[PDB]
Amino acid sequence: APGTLPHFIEEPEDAYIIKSNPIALRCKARPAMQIFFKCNGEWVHQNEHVSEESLDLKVREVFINVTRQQVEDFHGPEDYWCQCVAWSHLGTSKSRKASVRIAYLR
């Protein structure tokens, strides 16, 4: 009090690519002035982010597209993950790490 750090209304959920169709990672936080995705320790490019700002304090909603080509090119130790970082005047707030793996239908 009086200020508050960004509280996530919607956190990124674990998604699956079926088949070669791109997935969208939903993220919503309040109060937030900037919201950016951090996939596998590296910051995602600003042009890949689709922002949607509204007033209720400032509410921000950001969506990112993760294709099959992006996941297959990554050959790390664990599964392909994406985390949401929201900015405010007092600081930052990190959401849960959402995993994205390529699936195959029966």
From Swiss-Prot:
Disulfide bonds: C27-C84, C39-C82
Effect of substituting H45T: Abolishes interaction with FLRT2
Highest taxon in the source lineage: Eukaryota
PTM comment text: Proteolytically cleaved by caspases during apoptosis. The cleavage does not take place when the receptor is associated with netrin ligand. Its cleavage by caspases is required to induce apoptosis.
Chain ranges of the Ig-like domain: 6-99
Cell compartments where the protein resides: Cell membrane
Region (Important for interaction with FLRT2): 43-45
Residue stretches in coiled coil: none
Glycosylation sites: N65
Record note on quaternary structure: Interacts (via extracellular domain) with FLRT2 and FLRT3 (via extracellular domain); the interaction is direct. Has higher affinity for FLRT2. Identified in a complex with FLRT3 and ADGRL3; does not interact with ADGRL3 by itself.
Protein family according to the UniProt entry: Belongs to the unc-5 family.
Function: Receptor for the netrin NTN4 that promotes neuronal cell survival. Plays a role in cell-cell adhesion and cell guidance. Receptor for netrin involved in cell migration. Plays a role in axon guidance by mediating axon repulsion of neuronal growth cones in the developing nervous system upon ligand binding. May play a role in apoptosis in response to DNA damage. It also acts as a dependence receptor required for apoptosis induction when not associated with netrin ligand. Mediates cell-cell adhesion via its interaction with FLRT3 on an adjacent cell.
Protein's UniProt name: Netrin receptor UNC5D
Gene that specifies this protein: Unc5d
Residues of the full protein shown: 47 to 156 of 956
